[PDB]
């Protein structure tokens, strides 16, 4: 009767309420492969000997009278089972399946970007061992790995006292993982942190390390499950898969085979009915994420999970791009037309930020066009970003900062500020974001060039109001003040300096005269020549009297000064003295080259200036004939000054893609270079379809 099925299902599910969430894929282990639980909730029959194992329960759900026939006890039990099966997401038996709904799963603030709320919880007094478990996860997430280890030992003892098997098991695994993280952190500190800083940090005291090593050793989780009581094994066969040290034993293999299948689908051009491959990819991904986070498992930090999530999200984005560029056949349109696009909700932003690295985001942006897809939940993303910026500003404005948290948080902050290019932001949010970017962002990680390019990226989508201009002006004046010391210089990994900040300000505001810079210039004298050069770099920003003062103090004297002057607009033409200076520089380079001919010739910084002089010669700017004498010095120099004699076998793909607009038009003007350049261009695009090459080929040359 109905009571039989109700009692059976409740008996199987009774000890499964302790977990805050379970993957549905593993539910088969509960019923001994009797039913196959798809990701979409449908329960497909696989094997059964009796009747009413599950179908009777579903019928009870449909028929309220069948639920009424039950006693009060069975009524409450069915209500609880209904609540649980709703919470898990399991739907009606597969035999009777309608239109199933697919949306991102629910999660905790631990997964979201909430640090202040997290610290308030830690401050309060714990209620139950579950609260201690959550607090320990929060601590370990906040960098206090020593405190988290201590609390994990505490809850191990408490759960031993209270006989909570699931808590004991999960605590054992998480504590082992925190020990691993601490030991690897100590080793990597002593290995590289000395090189990065100069005085190795010791956040973990040596005696503490000895204590942890003595407390546990020769312990491998691969056997842990075999020690638990047989009752826990029989009931909780879902958690058995957590014991192995080679985590993600199966999930990576399923990912590999699903990925090969998806790539085959893209290559073939084959449509899909029912739940496609990408849909099951997404459902598996979110089940894994929810089980790990909402159940508070510490193994989300380790690189394995990061690689797994990177692969899943990159596959999903690649598939979405294909579905955006896939040509549709008329019969294909008959099968399906106007398929839904890819919405990048706030959950996707959080995952991409947390689990990628900056080179990997670069890879994604290189392969696909992320800017073509539309984002959603703009407000939630903006809140997450403003929380990030507020956290960094609060932690860095004061002296207080934890190095462990630095390692564990700066990658996320960097990736989030990088990935905020497409999301629109509020004016207060943008102000806080840039104020944290330009002022309190560390120089150990982000140097000046990367800082500038990230600022440009933020500028792209939501423009700069006057407040951001004021912030940039404050940053520039701070740089000028820092420039007092003689020892100070400028260093840039990507080759970008403060002149570009000034150019950005100027381009945004057609007229913007900074009074503070002019005051500082008026405060300058002969002895502060370094500050005079710095102020020369940012000259248009300051006022007219400061311009006259600086021009009086110094003028053009060498190639670097001439370069900067022509860059920031003071000099609009090359005077005879200037071109004479270039001729002497070329003579010096020629003598150095003939000296070095015995050695191995190299041209890294000189090639820039020589190529620039060649470009000017091409553009009919410089009329001096002596430059022709230096022919044969550098391949690009000969290419531009005398293309005709130059042999067209030194062309480099770097120039053939990183071309230049007006110069591109001029090359297109000249037939002699045009023949060979279009030949090589079409050859290269044919061999490999690179977007920039196609753009050059289609836009200018034809």
């Amino acid at each position: 009767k109905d009571d039989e099925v109700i009692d059976y299902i409740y008996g199987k599910i009774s000890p499964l309420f302790a977990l805050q969430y379970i993957r549905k894929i593993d539910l088969k282990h509960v019923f001994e492969y009797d039913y196959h639980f798809e990701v979409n909730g449908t329960v497909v029959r696989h094997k059964n000997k009796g009747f009413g194992y599950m179908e009777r329960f579903f019928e009870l759900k449909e028929s309220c009278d069948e639920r009424s026939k039950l006693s009060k006890k069975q009524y409450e039990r069915f209500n609880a089972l209904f609540n649980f099966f709703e919470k898990n997401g399991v739907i009606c038996m597969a035999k009777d399946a309608g239109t199933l709904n697919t949306s991102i799963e629910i999660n905790s603030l631990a997964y979201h970007g909430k640090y202040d709320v997290m610290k308030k919880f830690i401050e309060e007094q714990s209620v139950s061992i579950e609260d201690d478990y959550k607090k320990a996860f929060f601590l370990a997430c906040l960098g206090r790995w020593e405190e988290s280890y201590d609390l994990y030992s505490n809850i191990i003892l408490n759960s031993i006292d209270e006989s909570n098997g699931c808590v004991y098991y999960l605590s054992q695994i998480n504590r082992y993982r925190i020990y691993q993280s601490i030991t690897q952190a100590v080793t990597q500190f002593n290995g590289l942190g000395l090189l990065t800083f100069g005085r190795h940090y010791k956040p973990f005291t040596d005696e503490f390390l000895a204590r942890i090593e003595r407390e546990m050793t020769n312990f491998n989780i691969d056997d842990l499950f075999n020690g638990m009581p047989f009752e826990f094994q029989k009931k909780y066969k879902i958690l058995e898969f957590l014991s192995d040290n080679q985590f993600l034993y199966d999930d990576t293999v399923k990912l590999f085979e699903l990925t090969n299948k998806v790539r085959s689908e893209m290559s073939e051009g084959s449509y899909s009915f029912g739940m496609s491959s990408d849909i099951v990819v997404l459902l598996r991904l979110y089940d894994n994420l929810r089980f790990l986070y909402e159940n508070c498992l510490w193994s989300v930090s380790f690189h394995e999970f990061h690689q797994y999530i990177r692969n899943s999200m990159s596959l999903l984005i690649e598939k979405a791009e294909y579905e955006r560029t896939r040509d549709i056949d008329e019969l294909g349109f008959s099968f399906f037309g106007k398929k839904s696009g890819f919405f990048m909700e706030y959950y996707d932003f959080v995952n991409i930020s947390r689990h990628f690295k900056i080179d990997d985001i670069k890879n994604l942006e290189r392969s696909c066009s992320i800017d073509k897809i539309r984002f959603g939940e703009q407000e939630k993303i903006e809140e997450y970003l403003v929380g990030i910026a507020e956290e960094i500003t609060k932690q860095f404005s004061a002296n207080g900062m934890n190095v462990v948290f630095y390692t564990q948080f700066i990658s996320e902050a960097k990736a989030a500020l990088y990935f905020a290019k497409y999301v629109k932001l509020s004016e207060e949010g943008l102000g806080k974001i840039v104020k944290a970017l330009l002022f309190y962002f560390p120089e150990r990680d982000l140097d000046i060039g990367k800082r500038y390019v990230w600022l440009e990226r933020l500028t792209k989508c939501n423009e700069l109001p006057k407040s951001i201009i004021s912030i940039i002006d404050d940053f520039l004046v701070l740089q000028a003040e820092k420039h007092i010391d003689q020892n100070y210089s400028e260093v840039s990994s990507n080759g970008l300096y403060s002149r570009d900040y000034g150019a950005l300000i100027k381009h945004f505001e057609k007229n913007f005269i900074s009074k503070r810079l002019s005051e500082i210039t008026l405060c300058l004298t002969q002895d502060k020549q370094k500050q005079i050069d710095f102020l020369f770099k940012l000259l248009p920003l300051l006022s007219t009297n400061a311009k006259s003062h600086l021009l009086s103090f110094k003028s053009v004297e060498n190639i670097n000064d001439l370069m900067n002057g022509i860059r920031i607009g003071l000099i609009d033409e090359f005077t005879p003295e200037h071109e004479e200076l270039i001729i002497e520089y070329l003579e010096t380079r020629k003598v150095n080259y003939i000296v070095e001919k015995e050695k191995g010739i190299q041209t890294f910084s000189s090639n820039d200036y020589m190529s620039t002089f060649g470009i000017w010669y091409f553009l009919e700017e410089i009329n001096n004939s002596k430059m022709e004498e230096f022919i044969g010095m550098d391949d690009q120099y000969d290419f531009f000054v005398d293309p005709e004699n130059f042999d067209y076998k030194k062309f480099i793909p770097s120039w053939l893609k990183n071309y230049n607009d007006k110069l591109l038009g001029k090359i297109a003007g000249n037939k002699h270079m045009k023949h060979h350049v279009i030949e090589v261009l079409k050859e290269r695009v044919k061999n490999s379809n690179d977007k920039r090459y196609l753009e050059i080929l289609m836009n200018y040359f034809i």
């Binding site: 691993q180 030991t183 690897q184 952190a185 080793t187 990597q188 590289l192 000395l194 090189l195 990065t196 100069g198 040290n245 080679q246 985590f247 930090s301 380790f302 690189h303 394995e304 080179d359 390692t407 564990q408 990658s411 990680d445 140097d447 440009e456 020892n487 400028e490 260093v491 840039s492 990994s493 990507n494 080759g495 970008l496 300096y497 570009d500 150019a503 950005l504 381009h507 670097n560 370069m563 860059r567 607009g569 609009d572 033409e573 050695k599 191995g600 010739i601 190299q602 890294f604 910084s605 090639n607 820039d608 190529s611 620039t612 470009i615 000017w616 700017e621 770097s654 990183n658 110069l663």
Partner: protein
């Protein structure tokens, strides 16, 4: 059969004549993209032309071994001494070697805080060749015959 010019990357301190570590070089990525004011926003006038191209050199090594003295003693600057044997198609094995260097480099690796299970033995250190206003790129090539 495989690459037969193993690279010797000597990492030395720039301030004084001491060696920091020695490693077996693994890869060398080069990039040249215009990102100054996105692809457009650079300075431009009717008779003027300025190359605003900015390029970066990224290096990665493996099996780095740090000097004992450097560990003992411990604006800092460092130099790299890539040491490969120049091999041509006509002369697959040549007595002449190729000597690449990075006198202006920044020791910064993304491996920092990778907490993989089963502690890994691949401390692949990344390196970025920092530039300066006068020197567009500091790397230098020289062939010893």
């Amino acid at each position: 059969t495989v690459i037969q010019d193993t690279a010797d990357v000597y990492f030395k301190r720039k301030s004084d004549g001491k060696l920091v570590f020695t490693a077996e070089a693994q890869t060398a990525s080069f990039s040249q993209a215009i990102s100054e004011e996105k692809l457009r926003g650079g300075i431009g006038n009717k008779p003027l032309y300025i190359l605003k191209s900015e390029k970066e050199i990224n290096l990665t090594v493996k099996n780095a071994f740090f000097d004992l003295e450097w560990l003992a003693m411990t604006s800092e600057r460092y130099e790299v001494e890539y040491r490969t044997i120049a091999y041509n198609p006509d002369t697959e094995e040549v007595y002449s070697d190729i000597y690449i260097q990075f006198p202006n480099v920044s020791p910064s690796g993304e491996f920092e805080m990778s907490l993989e299970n089963g502690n890994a033995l691949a401390p692949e250190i990344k390196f970025e060749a920092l530039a300066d206003t006068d020197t567009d790129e500091m790397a230098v090539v020289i062939e010893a015959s």
